[PDB]
């Protein structure tokens, strides 16, 4: 069908923090039934990024999680057509990212079109200081809400010299059209930034996803 | 001095909700001192809006605030230069949104470059179905923190049927250079669409603020 | 009825991060004036190791001046009285919660008190004892649910200038259908007049006036 | 030091919307299967007019299944044993905190256990008993200050299909000094085997496993 073994990515973000604007581009690819994915991105307005890179990388598709036989794959279903969320990234320090990612289909290549919005960021925070290194691993708890698809997940910035950083997740995801809603499940993530630039105009960015149940 | 008893305002909205993207330009005056102000905005872009237009009325500049002389005036202070201000608002259905504003002076106009977002509104929320009233009257809370200054305030949007919607505010005031910093103190809310037509496609609105000291 | 001058006898039970203490307390007030004053003593777990100033709230919306055209939920429940129950939530994972249980013999007031709160951080302002004082405040109170709540944005400065927030989000219950008020305010003012060195004594003030918009 | 096979006794005393009540339980596990099991008998303030299911998640980590790679802070933490603190807050404004101090006598653990829970609607899951059950979930736990912290997203299903979220904040503070671990997974899946009609008798079963992730 429409999702096929390999596919491509084709995103643009643009957005503001504390009130300082930025644009990024991005080309990627991944296996959507293998749930692996990767993408290149660039800083095309508003470099260099005054702020930490990771508040970043989760908003660069659950499409690319791996969905087991016995649990509805909402977002696969969703296309051709295709679907969009929105999501809410509360900082323990009070710092809050706002986000949404309209996600449609040319052919063989997913196209993303990204807003992303962060306020309240303390100067002498984690983030307005880039000391982050990494977002830990996570499992995403997603339920069935209004007809809708819920998303929830406690996230963690493990800092410099150890230390941790959280963040909740809030996203809601919508389908373009009627499909089959699943029962209470989860998917465990995994999202790393390969490599990347001085002040990281260029960044490598991957992520793993893989779906299951309770035990 | 650089604020006078009446000046203009100029201000260009550019934003979104639930991925709805909508712009917004507006223009009226007011008086600093007085802390009144008054403005007939316009939806440019993005209309009919699809959801309650009282989410926005508070980020369409507390210069606009009536201060007492014990009290420093972190507002009037930062012109020429001017300050910028970023809040967040969270409310108690998940809903969140998210503003920023950058204001300067040009003579005796004051522009502001906004920015709004908020997601995560439930379809069938007060606010995506739009049945809301308005905002009560309220008292922002003002500290300092870290150097800037902090002003929170529980807010609450009334409902058609009575009962209301809540929603709390968390807003960073940053003077764009250095300017004396207040002690703890409120800043008494007031604002109110005066008209607008059956989408909001216009819309006249009014706001009145005096700041006080604790009550005695 | 509630006479110009009344009375005031309370105990409270509770923990903090799961150490327990005990506190009672008498003292008096006026109902119509908005003022009260009393003196509490730590029965059990002291000397208390966190700020004495988590406490003071929780140590009766009756004693707020209420003018003549604004409901007075509070006044209007007794003889029977009202209880209520409160969130308060501190910017850096502290968290409390209490409720007082309010009951009225002749001119006395009576309150049973319960006091709880976990995730303080071993270093905050709050184990520390760094906190100096609550600042005024301004709480909203709304009707939902037929019942009356009302929330406020509090502060604690501590010691050496600087802010320590909490979020209070209080839901008050008559015992008996009493007339639900319009949206409004209540202006407060809680100071600790005097203690001794280590809060085993403690005389409180309270101070508010309920209004309506600006 | 911890058996395969151990015992468990334990009584928790609290309140919900300001009404007090007491439950009794006891019980035994497999603490390196990661499985335990226990009969609740209610002791006060029943017949309970609150959703059992509240209570469930604080009726002791050391039942759960640690791998070799990664520190068990709470294997590690006997025979003093451990306590912990923990703030559950519900969407729609109901809030939950409660404390448990945990002993170990021989082979029997020993938990003396604080629940406390506020503002829960009158009209809601919680007081309306609504509920059905916890969902499984999966706990991230990392060091904060010295000790140890564990936030997960719970989540009840109610009745006709649906959800009513929680967030749990847990403070595991061990009585002496243990190896800290690094950021990890406890998956956990607990539930009622059986009970009556006002729940004053329930037998409560939870399976759990630490992992590190991917």
Redesign the interface.
């Known amino acids: 069908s429409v999702i096929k073994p390999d596919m491509k990515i084709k995103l643009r973000m643009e957005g ?1 923090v ?2 300082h604007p930025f644009a990024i581009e991005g080309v990627g690819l991944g296996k959507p039934f293998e749930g692996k994915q990767s993408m290149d991105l660039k800083v095309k307005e508003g470099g260099p990024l005054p702020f930490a890179y990771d508040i970043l990388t989760t908003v660069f598709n659950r499409v690319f999680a791996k969905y087991p036989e016995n649990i509805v794959d909402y977002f696969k279903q969703s296309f051709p057509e295709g679907y ?1 969320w ?3 990234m509360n900082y ?1 320090d ?1 710092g ?5 990612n ?1 996600i449609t289909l040319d052919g063989d290549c997913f196209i993303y079109e990204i ?1 992303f ?4 960021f ?3 925070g984690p983030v307005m200081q880039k000391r982050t290194v990494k977002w ?4 995403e ?1 997603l ?6 698809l819920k998303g ?3 996230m ?1 910035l ?1 800092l410099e010299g ?3 950083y ?1 963040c ?1 997740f ?1 996203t ?1 995801y919508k389908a373009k059209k009627v499909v089959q809603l699943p029962d ?1 499940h ?1 998917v ?1 993530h ?1 999202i790393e930034i390969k490599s990347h630039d001085k002040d990281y105009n260029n960044v490598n960015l991957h992520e ?1 996803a ?1 779906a299951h ?3």
């Open positions: 503001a504390n009130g969009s929105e999501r809410s323990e009070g809050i990212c706002i986000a949404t309209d807003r919005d962060g306020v309240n303390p100067a002498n830990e691993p996570s499992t708890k339920y069935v809400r209004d007809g809708v929830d997940v406690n963690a493990l150890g230390g941790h959280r909740d809030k809601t209470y989860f465990d995994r793993h893989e149940s309770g035990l």
